[PDB]
Ligand binder design. Structure first.
Ligand code: ZN
Ligand code: ZN
Lengths: 233, 129, 268, 639
DNA sequence: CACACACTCTCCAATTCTCTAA
DNA sequence: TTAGAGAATTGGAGAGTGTGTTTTTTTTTTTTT
């Protein structure tokens, strides 16, 4: 039609972008693409080979390898982990997509091991909310594995438009608006369970290990959530 | 270790395919739906799950009387005409045990069993051995 | 102190993000309620700002249930009790069973008649905002220099053994055995126990229980309990429903709690 | 639906990697074309074939594996052009009601799916090979059979390049291969880019000049000329280090803001009570203010601590920029740099001459001069970037191009003010015209800097012509006096301010160097009385509107703003025009900025004008009332 | 039952668009 | 060139409708008495 006929044709699109999280996405993708083993050959490219399989969805990364790659990136991820975690997952998806035979509907998860510092259960204060942390504990009770909705696909009932990738809070959430920009609907939506994405979910109670328990105290218990590759481990 | 469990829905002529205590194989559709009770129990949007049963087969009754084919009943009836079948049936009781022919005889008789009777509807006598 | 709750996070600054355009804003807490933005600033959608719980800011809070001291109760009365609320760094300083002089502001707050209605009872609940704790039941080279020469002083073995339990008339070999139990062997690796086990026998009314209670007060990581089934804390491990939480807890017995100390078992 | 399913099945099937076409492909494809021609206005057949994915499953395999079967290939190409027809052409406009908009979104979704499918190099390889063996023949040897095939091939490429990026998958982060980047890489590997260069440079095949221009426009849709021209061999280390440094800068800014908020609130929980009476402050009544929000807040007390902001009504909602900028894949950027270089050296003059001939002859569509002005801006900027050579763009340096751009810009300005139902679209067209005008005005400066006395001579000639004619001077004032934030984006305001700064720089230097007194039936002229036309309230209002985003503005933009305001204040003595309450709130933010040291020019100018204001205020207290409103000649009454 | 919350719809009037005079 | 009078569109006050709620004893069974 014309170069100027592009008023945002047919989208309610998101325009503020988390710059720190996107830098984490880019630089973590660089880390996955470039970090190499003692014998070279790009570690994590070989370990991404097993993610073609069914019921494999998690890549486990060594935090000391991340630190060796760059101190500032590892420090940023440690401090802003829960903020940047889905962006790391999208980086992993972009990395794994070089196979070109992956099921596109599949989710991929980043997991971290070999974190240097360890924290006690007594030290899980509000200052640690959202930070990457490592704790030791003794499992007391494990609950059944459930499917948890991670992103709902919804149908708008009064204009038949499909809204994909509705991300879930700690409450089951419908679209805030219809994806159709002129549609006035804001509560009449129907979840399509077959086209939505779920994750395996399991909650386990733990308590302080015998070594770490302070003298005379009652054991302090904690609730831990396991997801995807980690459930029933 | 504590056992995991699932709910399963039996519909139409699948009802009373099993009782509590039965070992079964269960073919069905693994189905999920939203449950606000589970959501408020867990704090995460957890979906309830159930199996929509399509086929129930007791691991006890690998062969029912209804499973017997015309080939099977023809085999059984023709095999009964051997006229040495009593010795064959006795020998088939625990074929990996040498000797104990009297034990095999008694166990064959108990395994096949007699008939319950109730003359006059007022005097029951057991048929089991 | 009668009980101490789990760590309660109190929101200090709410983080909101627009679910249409991802524009974010932050709201300060006004006496316990949020001034939620009804509209977005970047875009202009209504009711589009959603509270991002884990991007918000929180601080620690804890409830403590405190009984009046036994030494302070009037004659023959059931004890009175108050609720304290501690925050930030004073939260994790006090455990159940402790005795404290607590300084704080005596607050009075309303309680709503039921959780889905804002009518409040005319009679107010009261609690104490903790400003300061002082524990009142708590009771290096300058020691090493003394101990080095005291170890090579003559008959230091007898001196330490006689120092054990001065309040009772002396049983020399019992005190010597308890001293060697306190010091123990050397733990090395294979599987041989450095721990030393001692048994005392005699009538009821002998000094054996005084010896047990003394060395329990002395040793680190010590335990004192009765072999009788009526004991305050059991010898064996068990699992129980935490009554204030309803979740299971593995109560490891005294033998497991004293994993690097002495376990005193009276009425063995 | 089922009849379409039957014909779609009759096309054939794929097995592994080989497509087995049925013998009735020709009649089934003709039936599909018939259904598409007999579509409903809702474009139901479009939606149904997109849902069936026959373009991805049948037509691309047929195109790529049975291209020797010429009737079927021609039919498939026509069908694919029909299916890839853009949604704005399908529906005529963006629908205003939900049902047609849902159908528009469906067609747009399937177009995005087609663009995703079309990144395969094999399809563009077949297209390049068939176009190459067609164009191998002489022009006189062609007939309607081959000319129409060239039209359909180039329209297929145009349609696939035109498709908007999916709102879902436009969240790609920089340095990643978007769908458009992969499509450009497919063009590069297929070699259709070289065929486009040939078509642009060919004198015989000049008939396709408008088509080739549109292909090149949609190819360079996302790019920036100077940023693209800066690409080279050593960029990976540079961009890696830049990313790490920018990450640390962002983190430090967030930490500073967190510390300031932590100080603004106290170190006591929010339900920690306490109330104060601020005895001097009267409340909205006559009683003293009772303050409840904590003692910490009274250091920087303001009455709007607890107030909800207001809903800007729909009419007054400011215009927002249509897209974020993302750094595309480095391979694609290198390819586009090489394309732009070779195109500029080999193709650009002939293509621009041909497009100007088409516009003169009036055998072009309604708005193709927008593509012409885009090409002016992009390729002249790229030329000035890196090795500047005016010979490569000498077809554009004529005064006729200045006249054409000025006419188009004034036309778009009038149509924006009158055709109010697409005023934003007219504003975008005017923005393209403004950027082209800006690049011409920058190119003459580069000609002045360059060593050739010939280009210096012609630079003097064109400067004399432009500064003599009146419209080039009056257009800036015309734009400022009817600019609207409601309609035009802040990017347009930035470009207007920077172009005005450059224009006044050149005009001031010209008049300073030599008199050249007559202007416009001529009359006298001087730059001071020209600058006095910029003493209106509206222009400075626009300048401070741009100044509000000084945190996000470029350093050059901030220099332009502060230099213009310093010219109006220090050199024209119009400080009372800029004595304003909103401007003083902006100055308050500037002085309170923790990064105020980074804006040394702005804060120094702010303190100069503030000192002048407080001198006037000490002399006369009515200046405080004068702050409250915009003004006309009270600028002299205050003085 | 009946007294608070939660949600939708309608009307009213206040603001902005259009055309005219100072 | 500014701005003010008449007409049309949008913000939100408020009228109306629907929903949810206020330790104890007898008996069994396995293990331990
Ligand atoms: Zn809708
Ligand atoms: Zn928004």
């Amino acid at each position: 039609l014309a170069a100027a006929a592009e008023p945002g044709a047919g989208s309610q699109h998101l325009e503020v972008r988390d710059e720190v999280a996107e830098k984490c996405q880019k630089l973590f993708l660089d880390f996955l693409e470039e970090f190499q083993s003692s014998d070279g050959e790009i570690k994590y490219l070989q370990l991404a080979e097993e993610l073609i399989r069914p019921e494999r969805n998690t890549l486990v990364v060594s935090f000391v390898d991340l630190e060796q790659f760059n101190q500032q990136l590892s420090t940023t991820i440690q401090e802003e982990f829960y903020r940047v975690y889905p962006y790391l997952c999208r980086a992993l998806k972009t990395f794994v997509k070089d196979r070109k035979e992956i099921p596109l509907a599949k989710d991929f998860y980043v997991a971290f091991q070999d974190l240097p510092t360890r924290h006690k259960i007594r030290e899980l204060t509000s200052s640690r909310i959202g930070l990457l942390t490592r704790i030791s504990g003794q499992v007391v009770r494990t609950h059944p594995v459930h499917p948890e909705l991670v992103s709902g696909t919804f149908l708008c009932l009064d204009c038949q438009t499909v809204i994909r990738d509705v991300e879930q809070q700690f409450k089951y959430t419908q679209p805030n608006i219809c994806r159709n920009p002129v549609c006035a609907n804001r509560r009449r939506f129907l979840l399509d369970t077959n086209k939505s994405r779920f994750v395996d979910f399991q909650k386990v109670r733990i308590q302080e290990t015998q070594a770490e328990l302070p003298r005379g105290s009652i054991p302090r218990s904690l609730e831990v959530i396991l997801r995807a590759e980690a459930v029933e481990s | 270790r504590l056992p995991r469990s699932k709910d399963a829905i039996l519909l139409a002529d699948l009802v009373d395919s099993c009782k509590p205590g039965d070992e079964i194989e269960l073919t069905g559709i693994y189905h999920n739906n939203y449950d606000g009770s589970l959501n408020t129990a867990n704090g995460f949007p957890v979906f309830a799950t159930v199996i929509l049963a399509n086929h129930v087969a007791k691991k006890d009754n690998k062969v029912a009387v209804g499973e017997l084919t015309d080939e099977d009943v023809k085999m059984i009836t023709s095999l009964s005409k051997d006229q040495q079948i009593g010795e064959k049936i006795f020998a088939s009781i625990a074929p990996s045990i040498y000797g104990h022919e009297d034990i095999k005889r008694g166990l064959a008789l108990a395994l096949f069993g007699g008939e319950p009777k109730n003359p006059g509807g007022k005097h029951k006598v057991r048929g089991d051995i | 102190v009668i009980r101490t709750s789990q760590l309660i996070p109190e929101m200090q600054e709410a983080f909101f993000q627009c679910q249409v355009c991802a524009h974010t804003t932050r709201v300060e807490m006004d006496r316990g309620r949020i001034a939620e933005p009804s509209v977005c600033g970047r875009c202009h959608t209504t009711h589009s700002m959603a509270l991002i719980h884990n991007r918000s800011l929180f601080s620690d809070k804890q409830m403590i249930k405190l009984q009046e001291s036994p030494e302070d109760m009037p004659a023959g009365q059931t004890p009175h009790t108050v609720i304290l609320f501690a925050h930030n760094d004073l939260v994790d300083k006090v455990q159940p069973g402790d005795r404290v002089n607590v300084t704080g502001i005596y607050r009075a707050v309303p309680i709503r008649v039921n959780p889905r209605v804002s009518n409040v009872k005319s009679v107010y609940k009261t609690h104490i905002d903790v400003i300061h704790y002082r524990k009142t039941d708590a009771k290096s080279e300058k020691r090493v220099e003394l101990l080095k020469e005291l170890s090579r002083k003559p008959d230091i073995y007898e001196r330490l053994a006689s120092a054990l339990a001065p309040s009772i008339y002396e049983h020399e070999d019992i005190k010597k055995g308890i001293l060697l139990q306190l010091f123990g062997g050397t733990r090395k690796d294979g599987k041989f126990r450095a721990e030393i086990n001692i048994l005392l026998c005699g009538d009821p009314g002998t000094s054996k229980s005084q010896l047990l209670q003394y060395v329990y007060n002395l040793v680190p990581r010590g335990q004192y309990t009765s072999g009788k089934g009526s004991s305050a804390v059991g010898l064996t491990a068990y699992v129980m429903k935490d009554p204030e939480t309803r979740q299971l807890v593995l109560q490891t017995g005294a033998l497991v709690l004293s994993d690097n100390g002495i376990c005193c078992i009276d009425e063995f | 639906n089922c009849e379409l399913l039957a014909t779609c099945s009759a096309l054939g099937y794929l097995e592994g990697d080989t497509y087995h076409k049925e013998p009735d492909c020709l009649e089934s494809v003709k039936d599909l074309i018939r259904y598409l021609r007999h579509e409903d206005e809702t474009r139901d057949v479009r939606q149904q074939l997109g849902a069936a994915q026959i373009l991805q499953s049948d037509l691309l395999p047929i195109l790529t594996q049975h291209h020797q079967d010429k009737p079927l290939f021609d039919a498939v190409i026509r069908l694919m052009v029909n299916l890839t027809q853009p949604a704005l052409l399908c529906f005529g406009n963006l629908p205003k009601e939900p049902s047609f908009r849902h159908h528009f979104l469906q067609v747009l979704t399937y177009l995005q799916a087609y663009k995703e499918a079309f990144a395969s190099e094999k399809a563009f390889g077949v297209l390049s090979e068939t176009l190459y063996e067609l164009l191998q023949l002489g022009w006189e040897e062609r007939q309607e059979e081959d000319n129409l095939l060239i039209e359909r091939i180039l329209l297929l490429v145009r349609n696939i390049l035109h498709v908007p990026a999916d709102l879902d998958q436009e969240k790609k982060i920089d340095d990643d291969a978007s769908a458009h980047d992969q499509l450009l890489w497919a063009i590069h590997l297929s070699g259709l880019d070289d065929l486009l260069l040939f078509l642009a440079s060919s004198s015989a095949e000049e008939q396709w000049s408008l088509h080739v221009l549109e292909i090149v426009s949609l190819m360079f849709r996302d790019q920036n000329p100077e940023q693209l021209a800066g690409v080279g061999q050593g960029r990976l280390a540079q961009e890696r280090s830049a990313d790490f440094a920018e990450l640390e800068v962002l983190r430090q800014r967030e930490m500073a803001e967190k510390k300031t908020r932590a100080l603004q609130r106290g170190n006591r929980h929010s339900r920690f009570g306490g109330s104060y009476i601020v005895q001097g402050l009267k409340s909205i009544g006559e009683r003293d203010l009772i303050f409840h929000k904590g003692l910490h807040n009274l250091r920087n007390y303001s009455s709007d601590l607890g107030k909800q902001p207001k809903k800007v009504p729909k009419r007054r909602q400011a215009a927002r920029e249509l897209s974020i900028q993302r750094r595309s894949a480095l391979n694609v950027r290198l390819f586009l740099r090489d394309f732009c270089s070779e195109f500029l050296e080999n193709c650009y003059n002939r293509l621009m001459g041909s497009v100007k001939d088409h516009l003169l002859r009036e055998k072009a569509q309604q708005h193709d001069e927008t593509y012409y002005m885009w090409a002016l801006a992009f390729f002249m900027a790229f030329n000035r970037a890196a090795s500047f050579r005016p010979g490569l763009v000498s077809e554009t340096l004529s005064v006729r191009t200045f006249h054409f751009i000025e006419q188009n810009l004034t036309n778009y300005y009038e149509m924006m003010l009158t055709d109010r139902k697409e005023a934003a679209s007219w504003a975008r067209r005017m923005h393209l015209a403004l950027k082209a005008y800006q690049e011409l005005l920058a190119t003459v400066n580069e000609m002045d800097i360059s060593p050739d006395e010939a280009v210096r001579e012609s630079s003097r000639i064109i400067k004399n012509n432009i500064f003599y004619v009146m419209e080039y001077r009056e257009l800036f004032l015309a734009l400022f006096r009817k600019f609207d934030e409601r309609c035009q984006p802040r990017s347009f305001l930035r470009d207007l301010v920077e172009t005005t700064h450059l224009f006044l720089k050149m005009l001031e230097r010209f008049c300073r160097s030599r008199g050249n007194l007559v202007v416009q039936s001529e009359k006298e002229f001087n730059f001071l009385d020209y600058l006095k036309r910029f003493a209106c309230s509206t222009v400075v209002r626009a300048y401070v509107l741009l100044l509000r985003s000084y945190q996000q503005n470029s350093a050059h933009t901030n220099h332009c703003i502060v230099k213009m305001l310093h010219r109006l204040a220090h050199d024209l003595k119009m400080e009372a025009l800029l004595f304003q309450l909103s401007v003083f709130c902006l100055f308050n933010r500037l002085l309170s900025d923790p990064a105020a040291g980074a804006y040394k020019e702005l804060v120094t100018f702010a303190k100069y004008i503030l000192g002048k204001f407080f001198a006037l205020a000490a002399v006369n207290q009515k200046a405080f009332v004068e702050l409250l409103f915009w003004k006309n000649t009270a600028v002299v009454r205050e003085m």
